[PDB]
Ligand binder design. Sequence first.
Ligand SMILES: CCCC[C@@]1(C2CCCC2)Cc2cc(OCCCC(=O)O)c(Cl)c(Cl)c2C1=O
Lengths: 313, 313, 313, 313, 313, 313
Amino acid sequence: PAYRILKPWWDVFTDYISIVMLMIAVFGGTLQVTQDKMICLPCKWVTKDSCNDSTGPTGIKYDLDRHQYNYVDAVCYENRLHWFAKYFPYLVLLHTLIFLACSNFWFKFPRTSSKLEHFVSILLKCFDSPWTTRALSDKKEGEQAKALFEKVKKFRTHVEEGDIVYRLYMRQTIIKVIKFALIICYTVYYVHNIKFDVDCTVDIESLTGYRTYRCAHPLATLFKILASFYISLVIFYGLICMYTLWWMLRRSLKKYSFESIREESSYSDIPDVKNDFAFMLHLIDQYDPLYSKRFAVFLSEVSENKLRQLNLN
Amino acid sequence: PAYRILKPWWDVFTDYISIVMLMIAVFGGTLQVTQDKMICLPCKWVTKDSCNDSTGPTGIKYDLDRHQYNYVDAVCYENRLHWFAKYFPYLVLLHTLIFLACSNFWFKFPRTSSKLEHFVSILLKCFDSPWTTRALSDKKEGEQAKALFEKVKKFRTHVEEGDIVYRLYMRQTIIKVIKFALIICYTVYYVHNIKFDVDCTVDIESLTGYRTYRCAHPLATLFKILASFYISLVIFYGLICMYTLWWMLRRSLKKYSFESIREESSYSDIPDVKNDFAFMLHLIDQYDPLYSKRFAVFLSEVSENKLRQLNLN
Amino acid sequence: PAYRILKPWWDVFTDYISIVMLMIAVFGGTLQVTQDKMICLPCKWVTKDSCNDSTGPTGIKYDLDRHQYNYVDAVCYENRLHWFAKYFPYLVLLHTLIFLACSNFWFKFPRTSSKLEHFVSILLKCFDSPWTTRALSDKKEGEQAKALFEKVKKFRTHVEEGDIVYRLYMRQTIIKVIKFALIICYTVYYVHNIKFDVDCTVDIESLTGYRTYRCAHPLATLFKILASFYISLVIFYGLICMYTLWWMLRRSLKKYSFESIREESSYSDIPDVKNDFAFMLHLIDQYDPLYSKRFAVFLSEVSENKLRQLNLN
Amino acid sequence: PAYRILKPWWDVFTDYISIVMLMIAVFGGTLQVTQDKMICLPCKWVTKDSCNDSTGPTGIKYDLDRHQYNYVDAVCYENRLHWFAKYFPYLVLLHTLIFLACSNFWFKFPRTSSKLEHFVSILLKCFDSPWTTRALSDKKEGEQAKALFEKVKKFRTHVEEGDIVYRLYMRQTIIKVIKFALIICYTVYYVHNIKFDVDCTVDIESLTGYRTYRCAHPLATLFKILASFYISLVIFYGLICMYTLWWMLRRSLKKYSFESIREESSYSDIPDVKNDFAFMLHLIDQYDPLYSKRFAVFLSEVSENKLRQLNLN
Amino acid sequence: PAYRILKPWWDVFTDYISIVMLMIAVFGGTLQVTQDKMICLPCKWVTKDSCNDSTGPTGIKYDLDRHQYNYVDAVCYENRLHWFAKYFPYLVLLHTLIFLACSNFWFKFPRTSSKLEHFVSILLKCFDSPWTTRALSDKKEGEQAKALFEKVKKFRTHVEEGDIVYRLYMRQTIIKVIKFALIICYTVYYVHNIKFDVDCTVDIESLTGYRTYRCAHPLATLFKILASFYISLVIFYGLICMYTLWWMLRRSLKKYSFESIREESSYSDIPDVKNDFAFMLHLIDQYDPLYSKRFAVFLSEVSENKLRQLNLN
Amino acid sequence: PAYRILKPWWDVFTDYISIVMLMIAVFGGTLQVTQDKMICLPCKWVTKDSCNDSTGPTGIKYDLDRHQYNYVDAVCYENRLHWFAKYFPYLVLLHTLIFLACSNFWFKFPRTSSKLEHFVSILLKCFDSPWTTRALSDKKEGEQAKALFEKVKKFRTHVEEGDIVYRLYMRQTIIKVIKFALIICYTVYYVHNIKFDVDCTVDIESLTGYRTYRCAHPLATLFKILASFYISLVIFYGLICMYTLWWMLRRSLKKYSFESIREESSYSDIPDVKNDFAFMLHLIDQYDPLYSKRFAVFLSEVSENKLRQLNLN
Ligand SMILES: CCCC[C@@]1(C2CCCC2)Cc2cc(OCCCC(=O)O)c(Cl)c(Cl)c2C1=O
């Protein structure tokens, strides 16, 4: 619908950071399932379960076929390779899906979807009411206008009693910021774990004839870039959601301060909201202060009284 | 159409869990048909039809080509590998298609599609009727309004006699919950069956020269993750549909209790529904209690009588 | 357009069974063209043109390269493999395309497309006529209403003379049911023909040096599942179209029985249809009995006469 | 736009036959570029530049590597394989594109696109004119109606002078039928040319050491099916366009016979068309005879005169 | 938008020739990046840096592995293969993108996009004005009509002063025709350069042991077809744009000749255009002469005067 | 929305150059991940850690298998190949995403998205106001017109106080031009770094037996083309954004010069804008000077006064 109004900048940036994060997850994964192989060779001279590194030169002959080179490639890939190298692209796609859910859960949950759609529906009618132009400074619009005064007066009490919307948005960002804290905790802790050269000692002499091998994961660099890119993409994500958390904890959005628009418009009799109609009003003010300024007229009694006198006369 | 109104939260969560379940089925399957191979080697020293595991080291020579390594890879894949490892991604896609059908069967079946579309069609007109604003607290809308009083009075009897809708939704969830009970029964029972190292004794010495071989299914881990993920995705699915089953068995949705909206609105003469018009009314109340509160006016006689006096005068 | 009205449940189920049938045909085929290979080995000791099956063990050496292993793989695949294993996915896609054509041929053929679009066009206007509400129990709608009385009176004779629509729907299902009878005849007859282990005796000793070989079709199981799934998907298809055939042969849909709606509505002067306007009326009654009940008013003479008196007065 | 009206059944069937023809061309081609390889082996004993076909058995050793097996595979594929086996899928896609162009050229050419769009535009207004209902058996529609009488009288002369439309449709089908005659001429003539077993004598002993080889094209069967399917798909195509050619040569569509609709409607003063407005009128009659019957009223003078008297009085 | 009006036939054919040209570029390229390999063998006996071509036969043994067959395949592919064989599909895609840009640059450039959208906007209103029907042979349309007389009188001077549109279309085709002249110059000159059999003398004896090799580019034929098809597709393109160049150089489109429509309509006082409003008027006349004939009325003074007298009286 | 109005030609060209730049990045990358391999051979005679290059000829035998040819291919690819050859396609996709963000950031940021949507919304109403036709040379449009005079008078002060829009467009191009300066700095500096023949000395004698190898990157040419194409594509990009930077620094767009439209229209009392409403007005003038000329009437006082007298009388 027209839900762009309810997405501040801190949820517009985040909506795109949660796409590029998806692009590397689906790119790293399709690359992984595509090849993600290991090239493993034996080491004739072994010491400490490691390669000892002990006319014209000739090649070395291990006497192995292509099929018992591939066996050891799999064994040394399943056992002696770290889980974070193999399953990383599938892991950051998971976390991406959480971030996409934790921002659209607000809209899809029906107890809050109705209230939001109720709020945007009256605002566009309030925004598109011709009569508000006369008051911010005929008869058909006046009856259309009083029709909107009443439902707004019912909307003023229908939604104001419930406080679910401010809590979801409060319990959506606060877990997103807890989520970003855990990603950076382990991801940086295991990013060093992946590397190109890996040794494996898998204990198969009955099949091949060698105990230790030396492997070479070629995608170790290309993943190390994406993880270093992913962490840097998430830190910018985390600071965004850390700011909106602070904003929701300092400004005290439960109660709205409507004394400024009444200061200059000479409408002393305008009520101040208590809870959960202030917030969504505090939110759309982030978009612009115009949609609330056009709304201050439908919520005053003398403005209704002036319409009533014009409607009486 | 506008059928979002008829989907509670327990069918909104489930609509997305039935997509991620599809994503792993189509991902596990395209991965399966892609490679899903086995690397099988012989064992020179055999005991109990198993590998006995009995200067510088050299490779072992079995004297086999690439084509009779691939033959044994297929035989040991078709016979001595469990059916649940090969056909798992095709199996959870089947179950997914059932869950998608068992929730849209409600909408597509014509005996119930008409009634539902009949219910949403009058509600939006009831919701968008300007006259309801006057009554919840001119002449053209009154005739438009009485036009809606009559069809609602016919709708009150056209649908109320049949009880098919409440039974489909009752026979859709109750088999879905029976379905979730069987998935968890066998899936956990065979998830241990898949594993990386598998031995095979296939009885082909005329072709290769060896009796027993040792194989290595490399995707055994990656599938074990998805199955452990699938089971955990289904248990959250099952508890959802277990709750809506309880809800439909405790609240007694055949009869609706409309005595609350009349308590405060001063409309004593409002009838109570008997069957199959209560339910769909009990359902949209889950979305919000506003669409039914705006509907209580079109179903009362004095509200029609007050319109009639305004229409007479 | 709005042709959902003209599709009963027995053509809604069938519309989806004809998609999953397509999914396995396109899945079996892309899988077939992808690999569909055979791994064929010789047999040194042959008896009856079959494999005779006659310190540490060593591999057997046939002295063949990769290119004369692939030659015999093709020869034993083209000749000594059954045609039903290779061309099955391309065969059930054909049959699927017939089933999709034999149900949309009704709509695309212009001699019948016009009549159907003529029928749905007046019904929605009959359904959306405000005047029908007064009669089922002002002046502008009355002229709009009489405008519809006349074209319906011309539609009553324009279409009633032709009988093409009832014959197409009669000649569409009756060949579909003849089609399902032939599919089950041969498909079950050749489903046993496909199997994993197949022997081939292709008579090429000048090239390889061996007369007989033993092959291994690995997809033999995976196709045997789809065919067993396809047959089970078609039997449910066939019973659907066997029921609608019986329905069209027992109820005698050429003549409609309109004596019920007139029994309670007190409209004795309502005509009974003869052919090809009864059927499409008998069909939409399957959707709901409401679209015909709202239609009984535009087809009566006294209802026109009562409008005429209201139009005269 | 609404150009379904101008497509008879013989151009509705053909519109779908020209899609399945495309499906095999794009399927045969993607299959061709995918593999389309040849497996070629030498023949030690040669006679007439052909394979002479002259304890336990052992494999034959030619002493060749994988890279000089692939060279001969290409040489024997480029030279000693017929051009119709390699380039068939690219050839029937060409012919398909012609058939799609030779039926939409009618619509895209601007000298004829305007006339057709002019014809469908007045017909829907003639079809949707409320006044035609009164005449086939008020004041605003009468002026709307006379507004349409005049442009139709100008349309009667604007298009009738030119004859380009009847010639394009005459020069579109007559070359399509000439095209179908050539396809069947050569396609059947070379369909036998493709086959599985092909010999090649390419004269390269300096590189490999053998003069003659025996090859095996594995796709020879699968293409032989598609060509036998393509020819059978085109013969049904050709008979369609052979019928519409006969129809356009027997009925004499230059002049329309409008004496039937005037016979029963009692409108003696109705003119008969001469050229290129008869045809498009003769065409839409194929769809239904109703759009022309509703059109006979706007083209008569007394019908205009009766409107004029109702407009005068 | 509705810019089909501004595309004559010589830009409708060209719009489709510039798609099939794209289809072979994207087909030749995806085929190229897919395989585009070379099979290269040595020649033991060399003369003039070329292959000298000097009981049962046996294969020749060069003693090379698969990895130093692939090295020479790349060296003889990068150096001793012509640049036109490798980069041809990427080259004709470039030229295609120019042709698509050189025909939509007219529409996207804002100095000319506005004028064109201004011209089509008034024409449809002129075409859809009911009053033009009376004049080509009431009060609300007259004021709507005079509203259009004035903006057309301002449009007559707003656009007529600038001449950018006629120069872009003049400088778009004249470079397209210069472009077609260069394509045919070099493409035919290098099409012979590609061929199947290519020799290479790359000077690597330290690695392989041979000086000269003989290679086999297998796609040389399939590209030779596309280039011969591309050249034949461009010559038909070039003659199209050579004709529209001549048309724009013979007819003198700067000044329009409006004396024909006034000859028969009896409107002597109609002005003749000078520049850049004649052209776009000369262009839409190519579509049909009807849109200009309906336009001659809004541009005459007595037609405005007759409206003025009807507006005065 | 209708944001084509706010994109001059220097942001229309750039919108397409930023697509072809994307096409080579996604083409170079999918090509890279596809193969991007190296063919590496040893050198028996080494000097200076480089290949010394020291009857019938025979092949050279290094005694290496396929698996220790692939190991060295990876080691010599990860270490002794330049980072700019491997990661180039992923690098120019990054820079492309910046250029796409740095031009749509203007539109997506809500503090500026509202102002722009506010500006285009009144302009189309100003453009589509019928009354402007009378003034540039009835009663309902006059009230519709005065309704627009007031909001424009509020829009004249609502947006004029803020200066964010002119700074974003100033801080978007000035960093884009700083970005183009850095691309050309390093890209040309490392484009020579990629090449076909590369030597590697990786210090693995324990595994293979050779110290130095000679490799062959086959894609070195095809990337050198794209980079030379990318640099040439960016230089045309950079000059575009260098011109719009100069334009924004010479014309002094903070203040608009509205004295020309008033010179000829005889409206002396028209105000001159100060900041941030001049710019967006200076911008749409680039599209055409007509949208501002039609706007000069809604911003004058006597034009409102003349409407007021027509509204008073
Ligand atoms: C003559 C020495 C025997 C060893 C092998 C054996 C002899 C026959 C094969 C094994 C190893 C190998 C590996 C090869 O590459 C596999 C690419 C498969 C694909 O295309 O995916 C090729 Cl070509 C060759 Cl000749 C060879 C050999 O010389």
